[PDB]
């Protein structure tokens, strides 16, 4: 359908994206809205609403610049906003390895559905938060996967 | 003020406050802004951004080798409608020599619109702006907020 075709073109958008900073251990947090509104995060962050692109995502995330720090939030096939706040979670069981971005996704994901993906600076590692818990070292194909899951 | 008015005004300021950074910078940018004549051909040519205006985005787009730095950007009202646009050279005899191709690509644009362009030189920081096929250079930061404010 033309709204199935959408979906796949976001998927790939994305995943585009997260690849060329996974290569180059950018630091990523985009948060994908599902059921749960997190309309009090997007407001926390620059108003964007702009249509996705790979291009646009990865130029959000480039350090040193005034979007980079905080998430992206997608909404309805949209990019809502980005620097936006995300709750820090306070699980005992995150590893310190992990940084701040990695217990906000968490944190994101224990008070909302959403599917929060997040890029290590240190290592280029992708990692996925849902319902509280966070999947690491991810495969390409299994970030494809979670995505799949999530947008049927 | 009215609502369009205020808008307009967070739009210039939005504008003036990204051209400072760059230039303080030497990030080039091109940057043109749709008035009465309609722009959809070349807008169609770039990246779709259909974004709401902040200084933050407009840096980020221009940040040097970046996927969206090439190019133009292209504003309607209140928009950034798309990033790494094409736009016509112009061929004018009086482009300064010193001048690179973002320049000519403004001039050029200028010729066969009423828009208006603004050119950051990643040589020299220096702010000029096109209109109506004249290239007025190395604006301060009052007069470029005076020409956008003239402009709406
Ligand atoms: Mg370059």
Redesign the interface.
């Known amino acids: 359908t033309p709204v199935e075709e959408a979906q796949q073109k976001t998927i790939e958008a994305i995943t585009k994206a997260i690849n060329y900073m996974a290569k180059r251990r950018i630091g990523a947090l985009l948060t994908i809205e599902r059921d749960t509104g997190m309309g009090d995060y997007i407001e926390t962050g620059?108003?964007?609403?702009?249509?996705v692109?790979?291009?646009?995502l990865?130029?959000?995330f480039?350090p040193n610049?005034?979007?980079?720090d905080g998430a992206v939030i997608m909404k309805n096939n949209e990019?809502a906003a980005?620097?936006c706040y995300l709750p820090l979670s306070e699980s005992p069981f995150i590893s310190k390895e992990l940084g701040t971005r990695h217990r906000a996704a968490v944190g994101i994901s224990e008070v909302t559905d959403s599917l929060t993906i997040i890029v290590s600076e240190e290592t280029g590692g992708v990692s996925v938060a849902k319902n509280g818990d966070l999947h690491r070292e991810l495969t390409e194909e299994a970030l494809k996967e979670m995505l799949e899951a999530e947008f049927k």
């Open positions: 620059i108003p964007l609403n702009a249509k692109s790979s291009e646009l990865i130029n959000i480039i610049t005034p979007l980079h990019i980005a620097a």
